[PDB]
């Protein structure tokens, strides 16, 4: 009766508090029903678990289930290799990603997610793209679309869309090797933009005041595309009909 | 005398360590002054509390206080249903949010902050913004501007401003629906973008090459907020006056 | 024999497991081979160090050594004063920084990065910028290069390189004050712009429909530095030498 201290069932097993369960070479369960199944696996807190190697679950209702998973916070389940989640009810599934925050699961390969999302009685907002990062509240990525980085909110990302990224609040990205700042509804501006580099092969983003001046433009080939009369054969009468400008001038 | 196991005040409580209290049913406190009061409580480390129900306190002198909170690290105190404090000294006091750094403080909804404050005996960087998300160094977002997300140090937002984004050092944010890559004093320039998409409706961002060259315009409006002379019509004397061109020209 | 609980070698020094070894005032070592040195030390885990006052060191191998040091989850080694260390064999050693991931390192100050980088036998991706923060698999900062912001995969930034922000997927940045899309090689498109303010002064982002339109354009600055007729001058014949017009058309 009442919390003890005593070997689990394998060597160097340490189980301390009410009703737990060591079973790994080395491993620890400090807490209440706490299990450590693997070797060398530390499960601590109130109820958690502990079912691979090397694994560490830290905290309440806390499940890790891999070679090297960390399961800190509240009913955070990390199955993956080298995978971390961290907060409130965070699943990871993948191969070495990471997840912080509140209800948001990351699917994804050497994926990431900060930021939180939704969980009624499953995940609605998770990440199924490889090496994809969200950092947002309620952000979808579809399985398959990989590289796309999210900083905002009520972004949905589908099917085949890579290289992406989208900023602001509610942003949605339609194509791949985009930037999105937002949707077809609300269109945010670029404020405080370096002056450009015109020229034929640079590529920056002009400012307002160089496109109301103008300055570095092809004066050579702006004067084709526009049928334009310079000042100075209009002054010398260059390129000029004679057989029928006599006929209207006389 | 000495560390000693023990039950605590309630059933299956378990008080580890030296003057360990323990109140909460199915409550853990281990260490030194590690208090659990609340039911499903677990408080491990160093002058830790756990004032909250299913509430994890690990570290030193970590404070939980809600119905979901995790204190992990130094002097954390989350105080916020499913809300996580992780590193050192962070607060937070919101509604599902979390806060990872040090010396940061978030008391904004479904709000976060990645990055450094300053506490000297208060917090003087924190985030009283609603789905507002801060990642950088000495940071302020002002209470009812919300869905704004910073990507940069010493960036400050005033009271009024929606719909945000700041990106780099040392930026400016002064209107909403609007992303800042700098303040008044530094501008960045934006390079490596893609080829636009000119157009009547098109909304993209043109390149340096594209102005230079001026490919796909508008032949015709551009020829009438600019009074141009195209070289068809002065090769062909088209919409000429006759009654006084006689005079001067004879 | 069997895990015990007894005092450490210093006042209100508590070990838990077997082989624990407790030396700081105030100090706690749970589980097995933890190690906690200094005064105020928490070392819970498996094979466990806590070499600095004040300081956590929770999961599987986790070494904390400074006035502040949170070391959580795996291999973890958080070497810095206010510093930590989260995820799976994460090394900080710099002042006031924070880690978050798999196999990443942090050396510079007020610093942080989330991600996935490499370890082989070595941290071949690492963070030696002050005042950066990286977002991103594989990214790395020289030293040197500080106010550097990174949200993107496989981005390398060289040395002097300040207040340069890089997006996207394979991002390259080589210039100061300056904000990154992509590299020479892929270009990424900007979508979704709002409206420009063409004015004199201001330096906005314009957008492909404003450079189709030409609205707000300089009406005279732009008829001087392409040489054009206006329509009234040709209608009323100004500006027209008279000596030798008179040759050609008789």
Not at 76 to 83: F, I, P, Q, R
Not at 133 to 158: E, Q
């Amino acid at each position: 009766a009442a919390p003890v201290i005593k070997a689990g069932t394998a060597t160097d097993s340490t189980e301390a508090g009410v009703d737990n369960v060591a079973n790994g070479v080395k491993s620890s369960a400090f807490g209440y029903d706490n299990k450590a199944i693997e070797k060398e696996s530390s499960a601590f807190g109130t109820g958690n678990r502990a079912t691979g190697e090397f694994s560490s679950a830290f905290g309440f209702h806390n499940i890790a289930s891999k070679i090297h998973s960390s399961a800190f916070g509240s009913n955070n389940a990390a199955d993956g290799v080298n995978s971390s989640a961290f907060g409130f009810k965070n699943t990871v599934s993948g191969f070495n990603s990471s997840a912080f925050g509140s209800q948001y699961q990351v699917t994804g390969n050497f994926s990431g997610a900060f930021g939180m999302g939704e969980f009624n009685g499953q995940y609605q907002y998770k990440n199924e793209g490889n090496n994809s990062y969200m950092i947002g509240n309620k952000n979808k990525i579809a399985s398959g679309s990989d590289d796309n980085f999210i900083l905002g909110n009520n972004v949905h990302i589908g099917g085949g869309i890579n290289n992406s990224v989208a900023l602001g609040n509610n942003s949605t990205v339609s194509a791949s090797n985009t930037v999105s700042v937002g949707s077809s509804t609300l269109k945010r501006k670029i404020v405080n933009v370096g002056d450009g580099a015109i020229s034929a092969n640079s590529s920056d983003a002009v400012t307002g005041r160089q496109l109301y001046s103008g300055n570095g433009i092809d004066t050579a080939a702006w004067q084709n595309k526009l049928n334009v009369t310079r000042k100075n054969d209009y002054k010398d009468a260059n390129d000029i009909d004679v057989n029928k400008w006599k006929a209207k001038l006389g």
